[PDB]
Amino acid sequence: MQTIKCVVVGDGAVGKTCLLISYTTNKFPSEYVPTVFDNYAVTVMIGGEPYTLGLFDTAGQEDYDRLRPLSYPQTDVFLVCFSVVSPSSFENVKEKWVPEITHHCPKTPFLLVGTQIDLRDDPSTIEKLAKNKQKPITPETAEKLARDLKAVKYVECSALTQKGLKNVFDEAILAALEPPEPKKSRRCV
Amino acid sequence: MQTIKCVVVGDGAVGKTCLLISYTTNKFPSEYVPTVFDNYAVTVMIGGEPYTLGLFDTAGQEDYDRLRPLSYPQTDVFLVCFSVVSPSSFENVKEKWVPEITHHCPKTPFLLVGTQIDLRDDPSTIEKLAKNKQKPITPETAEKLARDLKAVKYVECSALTQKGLKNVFDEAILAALEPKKSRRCV
């Protein structure tokens, strides 16, 4: 049967794993975030046909720069994630993630994914960011970065409340649908 | 250019038109709501390619009946709508709507759409339903009907709050794609 491979990249603490667990188990892991870097599968109906959506988690720490690319082969679509309450992670999108992804897979599309949006309305978080003269990343600022980096589009969500979650992956699926053309797919090689 | 035609059908007072207006303009029609079955359109990017999604509105009144079938030609997918706070509209789903669509277009797939889910929390709508010894339709019930009716699946939304709106059309699009062997209504 038909398959789509999606790889999730982004800095540590961005919420990549929670994003995948909430989506695949419809339940945010509030007790203990699984430590293992795994890959998940979910079957999705597309035009009355079964499709397997392969979601691949990655290690965001700099210690894995040499090994991370090993997961990129055959990738149909990339999810480049950053936390909206983490200006640092947002800047690494342009400085580190898109460059890395385009270097190894120039033709493969990617979506810019803002995460942890529930924290934008968290007094505590605002205060912490304020004490350093920082404010949450806004959808407008992110949309501009997505446009300039040539991302398919900018989407955002919260794995906690699950808001915008399903949307992120519906969009990843739409961006992944490889036009039948003989053979000129954007699958990474 | 690639096109997908989606026709919305359902009882009156359900909110079919408000649903289409809210999705296409991203705002609920308060000041005024068209009395016309005006058809809309939106461009959606799929696999790097431009697709034009055509949304065709219709009348649910028992009068508009036979004329209504005139908009079915070339329909890739239907959205059988019903208001969750209207058990009446829910019964007409199986009793009328599904039967019609399947009658005219036996191959064309359809989604079961619950609307006005913003009112299940609203007090009044509850009390008024209590008088008739009735309660708001539940997702559990809808999913059952959707399954028994051979629907692609069930989805619900609120043209008002806009909760689940984009998801409804994302699913509608998903259900319309395919390599003759098409379910296009003819």
Ligand SMILES: Nc1nc2c(ncn2[C@@H]2O[C@H](COP(=O)(O)OP(=O)(O)CP(=O)(O)O)[C@@H](O)[C@H]2O)c(=O)[nH]1
């Ligand atoms: N408020 C809120 N917190 C979240 C959300 N998603 C994840 N978190 C929190 O962010 C922290 C990191 O989440 P995690 O999924 O482990 O991040 P990661 O990107 O996998 C980090 P690593 O790459 O090292 O695995 C945890 O405290 C997790 O609970 C969210 O949607 N909302």
Ligand SMILES: Nc1nc2c(ncn2[C@@H]2O[C@H](COP(=O)(O)OP(=O)(O)CP(=O)(O)O)[C@@H](O)[C@H]2O)c(=O)[nH]1
């Ligand atoms: N509270 C609330 N009211 C809604 C919502 N959607 C529609 N309505 C209301 O339902 C009533 C009818 O909506 P409308 O979209 O015209 O339904 P329709 O199916 O087009 C009726 P017709 O078959 O005649 O075209 C109006 O009062 C409209 O404001 C909703 O999501 N929330």
Ligand SMILES: [Mg+2]
């Ligand atoms: Mg992780």
Ligand SMILES: [Mg+2]
């Ligand atoms: Mg109307």
